[PDB]
Each structure stands twice: as structure tokens, then as C-alpha cells.
Amino acid sequence: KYGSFSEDSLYSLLVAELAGQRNRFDIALSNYVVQAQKTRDPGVSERAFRIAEYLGADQEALDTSLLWARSAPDNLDAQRAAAIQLARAGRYEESMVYMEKVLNGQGD
């Protein structure tokens, strides 16, 4: 049901959450993106993407969105987020695939 936390990943995510609490959002965002890349996990990637969006960063947001979409292609929210992010980036073919996936489901 739930995967096991690896020691380094556990420590990194714990410090990231604490830093995000302490308003030092920079460390939290960096740790979140690094750990999302390392772990390629759906929930961690989504949390990192949301944190990046709140911080207003783009390149980190693009990377997190791509990682979330690749790790969790099933979720339609991931498809929409990746589509918008990569349409902002400039690439549309994968955005077209994401829109096709959305059309497969009950979405715009």
C-alpha cells in the first residue's frame, strides 16, 4: 500500500517540510525538487510541483510537472499540469498527447 522511506530521502523530505514551515521556502523547494527527481514518486513530485508553483519558479515547476506526469500519467491533473507547463515552455506535441488523454477522460 505504502512504500518505505529511504533514509536519505526521509531526512531530506523532513528537513524540507520543516524549512517550508519556517518560511525559508528556498531550501524546502530545492530539497523537494531534488528528492522528487531522486525518487520519481507521484505524491512527492506533486507536492514539489505545488511548492514550485507557490514560489512562482518556472524551470523547477517545469521539471516537477514533467516528473509528475511521467511518474503518474494516469492522473488527469498531472496531464493538465504538464500540458499547460510545456505549452508555456513551447513544445506542443506532448501537450497534444496530454490533451488526447484528457479527452479520453471526462475533461475539456
Partner: protein
């Protein structure tokens, strides 16, 4: 401001990683983190403690009952199940159930081999659930009683006059409605005593505590002027000053309050408030002397933690915590030989009647 302590996080992560492997059973990381939370909470101060998805309902019950039950109290003494008395204002009482009724089978489960906790759990349940009990009265033919669980309010205050003009009041455990119940009890006492009563004795003995709001409400019900009790804490919001409103039904009647070792949190608040204002006389043994006002901060997943938010002070500034409020009379339970059965209450009644006759008569 200061950087996060990476050494502490590092040691915590190392300990968790090593425990999840060296241990001798499969441990889900959820369990380890939950136990870590319980550890960080329960080890700070003895009273504070995390609450799970279940115990929170238990605390809500203890504060204010409003629970689905048949209104029957069963006590297990010498391994035997018996009813002290049916709870008033319950369907069971209207069903003819009387004290001492012996239930031979609980929904087909014989009472033999059942612990008190099991019987309590079986009897208690969601309101509206039918329950069938086979009961034998005076060794007669067994009869089946069908009942529907309904929301029943548990009594918080009881009274019984030992003599015309002298009344005795008892508080078991403070609840949200305890203030209204105390006001109603005083009104009924006045009505049945023609509105004039020589004296009133109070019984907080072995009263653990409860909601601070209701304790202050009772203090206001008795006291008329001054500041009842105020709390100081690290966070500004925790600070709160409570003062007695001029409204007062007690009519300045003489008042003796008993404080036993059990009275810990709310009973001690009432006792300290009354004693600090020179409005009543405290007797008994030294109280628990715990000072702590805790808030059950809500949290996700129904598990709301409970932390010692702030401390309180008696109006004079004395800190009850770790000390307690020493009673003036200092009457310790003992046997007297030449109501009457309760030596502490007998002493309280005698002192109150003497102090009523010496002055104002």
C-alpha cells in the same frame, strides 16, 4: 531565523532507518511516524498526550456525554454483575427496570465470563440500534426486554438536604452544561426550601476536572464580585482573564467546600476562586495541586492532540501547580465514636450549623 538543526534531523532519520530494519516484525513507516508523534507529545509534560482517531471520541464523551445508551449503570463487584440504580430520564427506567435486576443473557451472550469493560461496550452503542436482553428477576421466569439506544444526558450535579435549612451539593465531573445544572440545582433548592436556606455544603471530593469554562461559570454562580481565575501562557491568545459577574443566585449563603486529594484541575479552580475571595471555607485534605489549562487543537484525520497550553493563577497570584491549595480547616477522614456516616460531611454540617447559629440568629 536560525538555521534548522541538521544534526537532530540526521540522527532522527538514522534511528528510524535502523529501527525499520533491525526490528523483528514488519513495521509500516506510518506506524513509526505515529509513534514518534506520540513520543514527542506524551514525554513533554505528564498531562499532555496525543489522541488517536478513537480516544478523541472518548474525550468528547467525558467532557459532555450526549451518548446513545439505555441509561443503566452496571457495576462489577466480587466478579458479579449488578445494577446500582437505573439512570433517571431514560427508556430503561420507563421500562420498569429496577435496581438489582440481574441480566442473565446480553443479546444471547451470558453475563458469566464477561468483564466489566466488555459488558459496558456491549451495552453502549449507536443510538437507535435495537438490543435484546434476557433478564431473571428474583429467580423468576426469564423475560426478554427489547430496548432502543437513545441519546441520554448523564447527571453532573446531585444534592440531598441533610436537614431543613442545610443543603448538600455534589459535583462529580465538570461538563459543558455543568454551570446550567448547578444554577438549576440552586433554583430547585431555593424553591423546595421556601427560598431561604441556612447553609450549603459543597462536595468536590474526588472530582478530577473538566472544561475550564464551566468551572468559571460555577464560580460566577457562587461568587458575585472580583476576578475568578486568569491564565498565563507563552502564546498571547492563551491568556484570558475571567471575572465573576454581579448576577448571583447564591444569596450570600454561608458555604463550606470540601477539597479532597482527587480534586485536580477544575474543582481546584473553583476552590481557589472561592478561598481567595474570602467567600467560603475550604476543608479536607491537600488537593492534587495541578495547574494546567489545555486546548485540544483540531487536526486532520480526526486525531486532535492535547497540549498544556497555559497555566492558571489564583486571584491573589498564587500558583496552584505542584503546590495545591491547603484547606483552612484541615479535617482528615477518621472515625468518631462516643450525614453521620460520612465523617467529613458530618464535620462540615456541624461547623456550618454552628457558624449559622453563632451569628445572624
Amino acid at each position: 531565523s536560525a538555521p534548522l538543526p541538521l544534526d537532530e534531523l540526521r540522527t532522527f532519520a538514522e534511528v528510524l532507518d535502523r529501527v525499520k530494519a533491525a526490528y523483528v516484525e514488519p513495521v509500516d513507516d506510518k506506524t513509526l511516524l505515529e509513534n514518534a508523534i506520540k513520543g514527542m507529545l506524551s514525554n513533554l509534560d505528564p498531562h499532555s498526550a496525543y489522541l488517536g482517531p478513537e480516544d478523541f471520541a472518548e474525550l468528547q464523551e467525558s467532557t459532555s456525554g450526549e451518548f446513545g445508551g439505555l441509561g443503566i449503570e452496571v457495576g462489577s463487584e466480587d466478579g458479579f454483575i449488578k445494577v446500582v440504580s437505573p439512570i433517571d430520564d431514560t427508556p430503561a427506567a420507563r421500562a420498569g427496570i429496577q435496581p438489582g435486576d440481574l441480566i442473565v443473557q446480553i443479546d444471547g451472550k451470558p453475563t458469566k465470563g464477561q468483564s466489566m469493560t466488555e459488558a459496558v461496550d456491549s451495552m453502549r452503542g449507536k443510538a437507535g440500534s435495537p438490543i435484546t436482553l434476557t433478564i431473571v428477576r428474583d429467580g423468576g421466569r426469564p423475560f426478554d426486554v427489547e430496548l432502543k439506544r437513545a441519546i441520554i444526558k448523564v447527571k453532573s450535579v446531585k444534592s440531598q438536604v441533610l436537614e431543613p435549612g442545610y443543603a448538600y451539593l455534589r459535583i462529580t465531573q465538570f461538563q459543558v452544561n455543568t454551570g446550567e445544572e448547578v444554577v438549576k440545582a440552586l433554583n430547585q433548592l431555593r424553591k423546595d426550601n421556601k427560598g431561604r436556606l441556612k447553609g450549603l455544603v459543597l462536595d468536590l471530593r474526588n472530582n478530577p476536572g473538566g472544561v475550564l469554562q464551566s468551572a468559571v461559570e460555577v464560580a460566577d454562580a457562587f461568587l458575585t464580585k472580583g476576578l475568578i481565575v486568569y491564565t498565563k501562557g507563552r502564546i498571547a491568545n492563551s491568556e484570558l482573564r475571567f471575572s465573576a459577574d454581579p448576577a448571583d443566585p447564591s444569596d450570600k449563603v454561608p458555604l463550606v467546600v470540601l477539597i479532597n486529594g482527587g480534586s485536580a484541575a477544575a474543582a481546584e479552580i473553583v476552590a481557589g476562586a472561592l478561598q481567595d475571595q474570602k467567600r467560603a471555607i475550604l476543608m479536607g485534605t491537600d488537593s492534587f495541586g495541578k495547574g494546567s489549562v489545555q486546548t485540544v487543537l483540531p487536526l486532520n484525520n480526526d486525531r486532535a492532540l492535547k497540549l498544556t497550553t497555559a497555566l492558571y493563577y489564583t486571584p491573589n497570584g498564587r500558583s496552584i501547580q505542584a503546590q495545591g491549595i491547603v484547606p483552612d480547616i484541615e479535617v482528615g477522614r477518621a472515625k468518631v465514636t462516643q450525614q453521620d456516616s460520612d465523617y467529613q460531611l458530618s464535620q462540615a454540617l456541624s461547623l456550618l450549623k454552628g457558624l449559622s447559629v453563632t451569628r445572624g440568629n
